[PDB]
UniProtKB/Swiss-Prot annotation:
The record marks 13 as: Susceptible to oxidation. It is found in: Secreted. Disulfide bonds join 3-14, 5-18. This is Tertiapin. Expressed by the venom gland. Oxidation of Met-13 results in the loss of biological activity. An amidation at Lys-21 is suggested in Ref.1. Tertiapin-Q is a stable (non-oxidizable) and functionally similar derivative of tertiapin whose Met-13 residue is replaced with a Gln residue. It comes from Apis mellifera (Honeybee). The keyword Plastid does not apply.
């Protein structure tokens, strides 16, 4: 699935745009 900025072993596009990982 797609960006859990609420799971924090982020997918890592999801990371950089959680603002993050």
């Amino acid at each position: 699935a797609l960006c859990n900025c609420n799971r924090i072993i982020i997918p890592h596009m999801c990371w950089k745009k959680c603002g993050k990982k």
